Amino acid sequence: QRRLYDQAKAALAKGNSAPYMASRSALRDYPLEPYLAYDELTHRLKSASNEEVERFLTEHGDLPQIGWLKLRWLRLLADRGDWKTFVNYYDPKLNFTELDCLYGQYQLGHGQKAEGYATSERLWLVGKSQPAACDTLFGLWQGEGQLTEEKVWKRLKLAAEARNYSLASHLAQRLPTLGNQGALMVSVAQNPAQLSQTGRFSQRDHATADVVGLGLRRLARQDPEKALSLLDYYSSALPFSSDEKVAIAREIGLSLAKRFDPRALPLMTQYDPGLRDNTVTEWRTRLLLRLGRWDEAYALTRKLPQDLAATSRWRYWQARSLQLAQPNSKEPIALYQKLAGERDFYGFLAADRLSVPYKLGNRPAHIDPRVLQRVRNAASTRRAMEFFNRGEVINARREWYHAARLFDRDELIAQARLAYDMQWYFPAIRSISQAQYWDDLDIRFPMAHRATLVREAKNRGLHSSWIFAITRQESAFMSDARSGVGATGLMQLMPGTAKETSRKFGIPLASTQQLIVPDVNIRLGAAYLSQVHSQFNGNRVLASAAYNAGPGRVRQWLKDTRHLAFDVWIETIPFDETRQYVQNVLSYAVIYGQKLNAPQPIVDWHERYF
């Protein structure tokens, strides 16, 4: 019928369970009933019998919030001494470090000393403060002779690496012999530039060596040139392990290569000649590309490990560095041909270099109504559906995403399809991407808000495919989206950005989250996108980067370029986050170009050189 399950929820949270227990034998086949049962038990969890709690975990263990129940209950079991029941339910894959520490205490008092020592050390060697449960465990562990000075040192190092200096200080204060070097590590980690005083860091011991290494690795981010000099001084003076040298050379090398300093190359080739560190390898090739050394880059692309050599990235650059190295050769044509015909950034680049059409290849998946039944029938789906029908979208979403953690490949797809058909564009993308079914472009590149995005595109003189693409990358059409920093809406405008474009364009001010309304957000984001578009001479490559990383950062990455090819520039963007953002947005815009019947090449003629 029309179940007023809200009475029970209104009574229970917060108050009493009288209407719930009246109704419990009425809402048998209501999908949300177990949320009521969950709260009724949770309010009285501290007096509930093991049996009743175990029964609830057996029969409703698929609920999203079951993890919070298991944590609250396992904590009580341990705090009462009921270790046999604790151990029967302790799951390490809940990733509650509080529980992991209790399990360690279990192990040390039930004859698993080797295992409890291993558990203890695993939780010791982190650079952050652990829960109170772990104090007890570190107590026992220390108590049994295990917390040696090396292990205190190793944790000091992690804590200082993590910038937890209060913890680092307390750990230096617990070193029987190395408290001098320990305070130095905290000092140097706070201000690694003191390493320039080479006479204060002269003592030939592992400890001082380790202090110096941490400092150089830190210094590398801010001032790699300075780090390199001091490395040049200290490498003949202190007894660095070869592991420590390699970790120092890595941070200095990468930080030098990110600012296009060819001093990186020799350093990178000595300390990782086998190409074992993928991040070093990619950045050596990147640097050779930025410096115009095509021969060396081609050579390098031929040695890549099989995981990098197989990416569309290094297949493209092998072909391109070759074509740039030997412009009269016919071998890049056949490498490009293998690669055009894929639907990704580098596939399109390859297509572009052969000047053949991009291959989209839209094929909706092939799911039998058999597999579709399982997922529409699933209790988790039924709950999500009933949650969605009432406005409870956070709950619906929480259901949908928790279901997917166990779903196989075929179901995930069926899941995706179901979400699509409800205008639940973001969940459908999440589902299908998790299935790794990339060829369903109907689902992965939806056309929400089509009339508004195209109107606002044409008023600002922007290609509409570009405004879809920015949108798609920014929020995947989750229209009420809010980021880890406060950017709101479809185009993820910050609140200062929105009021500053409103002013500039005489568009009406938005209440700082009236940005949630599509038609208001798209109007401001389009205007603002046109502002960065015109600020970089209509270049979408540069403007896309600006939108993600700010105009100042992009202007640093453009000096001193002269006649720098767009693909090299994209590839040598220092930040992984924005390299990918740019490649995505460009790629998406191509795809939206075909769906809007407004064809859009991966880059325009005027974008190919800056």
Ligand SMILES: *C(=O)[C@@H](C)O[C@@H]1[C@@H](NC(C)=O)[C@@H]2OC[C@@H](O2)[C@H]1O[C@@H]1O[C@H](CO)[C@@H](O)[C@H](O)[C@H]1NC(C)=O
């Ligand atoms: C999924 O593939 C990831 C990498 O993409 C994110 C994702 N949200 C989170 C929290 O991971 C979701 O998919 C569409 C976007 O929402 C995407 O987030 C956006 O990431 C860019 C940087 O690449 C930020 O400028 C956006 O603010 C961020 N948006 C949100 C709502 O988190």
